[PDB]
Amino acid sequence: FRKISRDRGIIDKIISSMAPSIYGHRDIKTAVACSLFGGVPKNVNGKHSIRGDINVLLLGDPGTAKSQILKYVEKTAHRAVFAALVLADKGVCLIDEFDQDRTSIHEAMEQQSISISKAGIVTTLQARCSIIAAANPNGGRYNSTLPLAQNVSLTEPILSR
Amino acid sequence: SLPAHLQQTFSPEEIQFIVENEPIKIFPRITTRQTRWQLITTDDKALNNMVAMRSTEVVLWIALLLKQQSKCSIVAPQWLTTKELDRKIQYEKTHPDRFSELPWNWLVLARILFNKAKDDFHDPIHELRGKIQDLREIRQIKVLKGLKYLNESHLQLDNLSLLEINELRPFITEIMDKLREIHTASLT
Amino acid sequence: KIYPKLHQMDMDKVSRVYADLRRESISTGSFPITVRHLESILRIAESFAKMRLSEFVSSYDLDRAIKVVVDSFVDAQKVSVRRQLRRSFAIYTLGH
Amino acid sequence: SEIHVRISDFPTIYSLRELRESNLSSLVRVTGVVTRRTGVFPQLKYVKTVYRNYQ
Amino acid sequence: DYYLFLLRHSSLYDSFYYSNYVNAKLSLWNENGKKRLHKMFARMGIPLSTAQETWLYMDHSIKRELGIIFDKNLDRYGLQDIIRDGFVRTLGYRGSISASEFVEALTALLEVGNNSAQKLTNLRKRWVSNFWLSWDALDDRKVELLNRGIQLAQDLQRAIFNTGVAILEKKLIKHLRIYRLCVLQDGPDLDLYRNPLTLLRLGNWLIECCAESEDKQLLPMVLASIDENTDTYLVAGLTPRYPRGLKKPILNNFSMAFQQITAETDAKVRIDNFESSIIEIRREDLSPFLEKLTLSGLL
Amino acid sequence: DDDNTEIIKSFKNFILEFRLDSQFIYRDQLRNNILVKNYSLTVNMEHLIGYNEDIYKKLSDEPSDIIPLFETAITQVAKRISILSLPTFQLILNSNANQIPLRDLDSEHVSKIVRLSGIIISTSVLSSRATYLSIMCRNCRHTTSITINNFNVSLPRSCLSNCGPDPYIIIHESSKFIDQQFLKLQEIPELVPVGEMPRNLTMTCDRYLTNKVIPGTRVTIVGIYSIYNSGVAIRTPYIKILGIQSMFTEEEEEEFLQLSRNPKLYEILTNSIAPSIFGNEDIKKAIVCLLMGGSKKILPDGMRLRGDINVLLLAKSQLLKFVEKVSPIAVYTSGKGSSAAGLTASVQRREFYLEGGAMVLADGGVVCIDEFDKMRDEDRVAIHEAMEQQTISIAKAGITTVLNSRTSVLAAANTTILSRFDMIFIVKDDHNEERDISIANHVINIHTEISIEKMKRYITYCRLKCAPRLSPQAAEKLSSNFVTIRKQLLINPITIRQLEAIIRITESLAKLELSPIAQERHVDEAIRLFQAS
Ligand SMILES: Nc1ncnc2c1ncn2[C@@H]1O[C@H](COP(=O)(O)OP(=O)(O)NP(=O)(O)O)[C@@H](O)[C@H]1O
Ligand SMILES: [Mg+2]
């Protein structure tokens, strides 16, 4: 490992090795590699916390290789969920298509841990995961003349987070 | 001028000060009999005329002052022994209203001598510490029965110790005063 | 095994670039860049350091992270705004 | 107080199709996906008392 | 009494694991050493989950059988020197303590109890308050403070061990011909070694390791630690010593050496400590001072 | 037979003799408990071990059998130290033995004392168990009694005074009972193996240990681990608990009073609100008034006069979070709401039911909405009642109820709905590079005037102590100004629902000074700040 890391251009070679069966789309491979490696989590009990996970969303024209790269990531990654966030704990979560589901994701992107109560019972669960999602842009085809919001069915904080 | 907590009562420090003026019996380890002590609130002859291992009587504060050093040994009072304390507990149990006739300074003197003079007793100290506790507990039961007779006129107490009275003073006098105010207001 | 960290020298340049991007965004009437983007830039730079098993982030990591986030931010905009952004942002999206 | 021998690499395999009455009380080797799992409970070992875990 | 680190507090397992002697005898800085300890408890007939229980609450039967279990088992691990005699004191119902445990509590309270000249002053003044924080623990009426001392002692030994393993595994000991050199340029928290006593404890750890690791070359050792506020290295000169079980005493020669280089040198240095074996020097001047030192015949 | 008496004698002599220095700590505790009618004793394991290790060994081997013996020993001592009748006393324990993680408990631990910790997730209602119980014999009509104790029984069948095969019945008219409660403990969140949902246990307590904890609290437990009846030869495990661990002063209000007499207090509070945000002076002033509020009033003919304040903001994301932090009570939401209740409330379905949104839930406090334009259709019409009446009323699908909505609303967006608010303002921006660089430097620092808690406590104090009234001078001033604006508009609208808003702002301004009367000083700033436009 240290021998190959000492060589120049190792970043580019890792990206090149990403999803071999799919031609082109180098930026998507770059983003997926970055999400699989991820950052470091940090926290300051004086009022702030920062996640290490990296979340990625891909707007796909019909048939532009999205589902194949999600299948590739599913076989590549150590632990993952494909569509349940408890099973994605310290792993990668994969979404290939898309109100309560979106609501759950709203809570999940705001938090890093999930809490729930029912019939007076109260309990907590952990999410702690990187989210990779893909979507079809509001019907048959994307419109480049317009901003992103016109082409999606998402709330603004999703595009922020 | 005077502090708020000393308007009507004595603190336990003053109670200790009062008890310290009493006489006590000692064995000195040195002879003073042929400078001289020249005290002004007590006899002076006894301290000037001591002979080693000859029993003599002095005030308690000087006795503790000597026992601080090698120069003296303190004889325990005769009531402060296992046999007598057994009999007093039996008296307490036998007569369920009267208080037994212990001296007025028994608590204070016991808790002074156990600290300053633990080495000079004849009985094992770990038994005396138990019997003193038994006496205090029984007396506290008898006190709690008596507080149901606070009234407009008076009360009689017997053989209750100084520290035990001083513990209760601000409660008894206050409640009794208010009963007096309520009663006399109806007469006027 | 690998847990990278930032280097305190070039962070002044990152702050200046952040302020410049915000000023340019407001100047063309774009939706503004935010602290979330800056946090994402630092996190992506850490990931790039981790990819080569480097415990230090470096200037080229920050450059690559900046390019990724700036290009992603540009792609979200309307066409006229997109042209003004890429004309000004050339020194970040292509140069550094 | 007691040790258990675990056997490994038994040289013949069945799916859940090939089992028949002739296999009863014989050792078998089988493969599949675990569909459902109970909680762990204690169970009485001898019928003074002793227990063991069960699932 | 046993040369085990605070036996009657924490647990039996921790008593062996952090013992300064056991680390030299079984090489606990690596897994091939730790497995020897697990193997020992398995052969001794003590269930490993009970060996980790708090020694007060550990089962009475093991407590009374321990004195015989050691006679049958320590020989196989070359570890018979653990057995010895010592003094134990107890008062009423509050439980026993040995002198060996008491002094570790005291020492711990000394160490951790609670431009350049002013900072030096502040530090030196803080270290004097711990004198009285120790003084007041010599009184049977204040056992509450002694327990705090013991709680601090455990953390100090933990932090020392976690630095010793890093020194050995990264092989930071430099093997010069005349003496052994070690310098800490960084650490998890290097401030703990700014006090002399703590530095001495770390040195005492490394010396047992070096004394048992090879039969050859009993050498002097030099140990140093940097401070980011002063930009000065705190330096200590340490003797070898003979193993426990083995005849004139040896003598620490660093004093004269340090003195002579100080008298000669251009370098910015300090000598004011009662123990002359301990010195301080600025960052850039460490290498010329050590160069002149190794060039000297006084070593 | 004799062993039961020797053990009781031993624990009796323990309580009567354990000194540490000069105080008999268990005799004193047992006496001090009886005086407040608490019949229990809290023993500590380490003292028992120090006194005599053999007693602790017996207790550690057979706890189910030996705990009752120690409890009756406590009763025998309790009578000597207080009588020249009492129930049986409860024994409670404290310990420092090593905690077992809840996931590792197994068949090796049945009928052993165990120490563990976790989070309480549920609590039962109280239920009754018998201790002393009386019996009637159906045939002969003879009678007797039994004494239960709650450690791991059934009615007997040895008939007395033939007398029959099963003749006994209970006289509930002459029997004694105690309280019992059930709880559920869930393993600690930072212990669980990855990808698994947490495991949990069920447990029981009685008498003084009941009604001592609530859901969601982290706790430590000491108790016997055991099994009960409810596959082959298999039983459910549980725990019997033996111990659990989990307005202003004068010196406070003196500071608040010193603040109240500061000549520049209004400036100080405005400066202390979202200090990172540049400019926007009047926005900060309006938020102070929203936090302080007016004064509620009730009249002889029963009409009721509102106290709250409402503000709208047209950068803006930060202020609502700041208000959420500083306010004594606060709720934060986006316009679509947390459920199909939306902002106000709705009916859902199978029988129908009703649930309230984030107007009912914030009752008594402050609520802030993050995008008021994303309000749903039903909420658009329902917020009229929620703001004017401080109520929400529904008569749908056989439901007929009214809900309380007593709250102050802060809102932001980007029409006639503006009429509902007392003040409306538009947020303003400035683009100093030093500000962004400072923010970025602080972000890197975390990645590598009055404080909030003091201000929140001060706001609470002022809301509790003062509710000021208009002076006559203010009345003449306000009425003259009101008719002046209406006349000016007539020759070129203002209405009573806005005069009654200016009054509330005036009162809220006088409230900071703790002045019992409002004055022209406050009226001037009120109309000065009324320039929403
Ligand atoms: N290099 C490639 N580029 C594009 N398509 C490819 C490539 N290689 C294979 N394909 C095929 O094209 C499709 C890839 O896009 P993919 O998203 O997987 O299809 P899809 O899921 O049916 N479209 P959609 O339902 O909108 O996601 C598949 O049918 C692949 O078999
Ligand atoms: Mg697809």
Ligand SMILES: [Zn+2]
């Ligand atoms: Zn009968």
